[model samples]
Target: KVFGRCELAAAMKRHGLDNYRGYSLGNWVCAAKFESNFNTQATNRNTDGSTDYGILQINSRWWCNDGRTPGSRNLCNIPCSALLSSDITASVNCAKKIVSDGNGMNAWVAWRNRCKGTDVQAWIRGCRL
Candidate 1:
């Protein structure tokens, strides 16, 4: 499931991602644009052989377990496959966990490089918050 920018913003906001950990929903939306373009089934294999999954691209190295990420922590205790579903609850929850873990939104490099310290409102400009 690929989401339109506004649709992703609205969907994530409904799941309590707005203003989560001091980052706005628009920040999250912007990260998703660079991370996976709101593609639910998006997967990127990292150099360490770990994979990033879902719209937010949570990594298997520490967040989810694909049963083959070497010493995967599975801190989210969810199968990476679940993150690929059109249903984004697991992905959202895991994203929250990353922030609550003190990782902040920088857990995704794209967030730091593309979304951080920027005017993110444009990411959700067309969406009614």
Candidate 2:
């Protein structure tokens, strides 16, 4: 959110979030872009009935719980608030398991909206991947 895009991209490579399962690195990279515009602390009370969190904008409905709100599987195991950090290691780790279980970018409606079908190369320019 408040740092260089390349830094995040660099960390993804180091942290192993560059790709997950069969999904492109762009899926996670572009996710960081549109969801929070790279804001690591971002959280949105979305009209879509889920609170989105962190740079990836992970949802409370299924991914993590928002301060003990109901009906969250919390498959990520980490606290929902934990995802709201510049240190994205936990986020990426959770996300890795998330898609590994068969769901891909279905996690992010924003991915479906902006990044989907868009030229990911242009968006991931700073990533240097």
Candidate 3:
């Protein structure tokens, strides 16, 4: 469940992200750590019966349409939970595609802006990434 830097780099490559440099890589890893503690199979259930799953913590209902069910079709025809299953590298790559158009580190900025109330510079400075 511990997705590390090399694995993250491979995931970024698989998703067509070839421009990630030093600070960018650090920033992305920081966000992923904060989001899921690098756990590929993490899932959180809400009191309302909905669920969030995966390293990026994608809302199961948003992508799966079935809230963590096994066979639900997501954007890539892979179930949300399946995306969260083994293969942490592929799972992170899938998340990059789903959330950031395969932009890797650039997407971390988006996640910070809308979800974490911070900007990329702040993230880099704060997280030392």
Candidate 4:
């Protein structure tokens, strides 16, 4: 895991992810919490066969390539391993690009499932945002 709640919040703040492009910091925090528990190396294969990767659980279907895959669109234009790093700069940049594509945070199932209508404040309750 790369960070605790507060620490992740700080990192997000430092990276200018705290409401960049109009998405709130709490939204990002909530999604990260449910998606990967702040672990940069998190990965999970979905029932549909596409895998989720990294802190945001970006999908292999459209965001990244695991490499050697036959058909990876790799919209992020990056290898899957790139997202699994303590240096989250690229991951965050790619996430911003994902949101920019019109899905907003809805691209993350975790966000749509658990964060929508939820109290995002709790995600940063102890953080000095």
Candidate 5:
């Protein structure tokens, strides 16, 4: 269940996390590890794709729609299907908003607070400044 690094990087950038490379890397890995064990294509069938899915284990219906078609769903006023595409960056950006209202590091910090206890190694491994 290898998630694409490029997609992850794009996601970091979308969140305006270009400066916190280390944090963003850790956040991305932690998200994948804790969420779906790095399964980018993973889906929560029990919730019918509503609770969580993907590398970041994002809530499909809550954050985005499971349908591949565009304009199928919406999250916080943004189209869900659009965020789930290769535009995962959009998803990450949306998450940032949920965490910090567009503040980058604040969002990262909040995410870290929640996930740090899970597996710090998996979160920071390969993370670079």
Candidate 6:
């Protein structure tokens, strides 16, 4: 499912991403916009044979196990397929784990490249929390 902008914001809020780890809701919303456009089933494969899956495009190399990525740590201990579902519980949980792992939101190059210096709040403007 491709979520509406405000709908995705609200969903992330419900998942405790609002102000999570010093990153604002706008930050997350902005990352989601560029990462997967709020599409739950988005996937991207890397040249190294690892794949990124779902809304946030969590990578298979170190996060979820895709069974295809050689030497995947599966640190999230979740199957990559689980990240593709419309229900984002597993995705959000894994995102939180990623943040807690000390990489911060910078783990996402999309966030670093696009969202870091911009007015991320504008991404969620007029969206009710």
User: Which 10-residue window in model 5 sums to the lowest lDDT?
Assistant: 101-110
User: 78 in model 2: Cα distance from truth in Å?
Assistant: 1.3
Task: Report residue 88 deviation for candidate 6 (angstroms).
Answer: 1.2
Which residue segments of model 5 deviate by more than 4 Å?
Answer: 4-15, 18-24, 47-49, 66-73, 101-114, 118-122, 126-129
Better of 1 and 5 by lDDT: 1
What is the TM-score (0 to 1) of candidate 1? 0.97
Report the lDDT tens digits of candidate 5 across residue range 1-129: 355545555456555754453454556555555555555555555434254555555554445655653334445555444444544565566665554545443333435566655554454445342
The weakest ten consecutive residues by lDDT in model 2 span 120-129
Each candidate's number of clashing pairs is 0, 2, 0, 0, 0, 0
How far residue 114's Cα lies from its native spot in candidate 6, in Å, is 0.5
lDDT score at residue 45, model 4, on the 0-100 scale: 86
Candidate 2 per-residue lDDT, tens place, 58-106, comes to: 7787778776556657878778888987688878887787667665777
Number of backbone clashes in candidate 1: 0
Q: What is the C-alpha lDDT profile of model 4 across 69-128, one tens digit per residue?
A: 557689899988888999888789899899899868888888999998899978899777
> Model 5 compared with the native: what TM-score?
0.52
Model 3 CA deviation exceeding 4 Å by range? 5-7, 18-23, 65-73, 100-110, 113-129
Model 6 stretches astray by more than 4 angstroms = none
The clash number for model 2 is 2
2-21 per-residue lDDT for model 3 (tens digits)? 66655664564555543433
RMSD of 2: 2.1
Any runs in candidate 4 off by more than 4 Å, and if so which?
A: none
Q: Between candidates 2 and 4, which one is better according to TM-score? A: 4
Model 4 residue 112 lDDT score? 94
Task: Provide the overall lDDT of each model, using Cα atoms, as 2-decimal numbers.
Answer: 0.92, 0.75, 0.55, 0.86, 0.52, 0.92
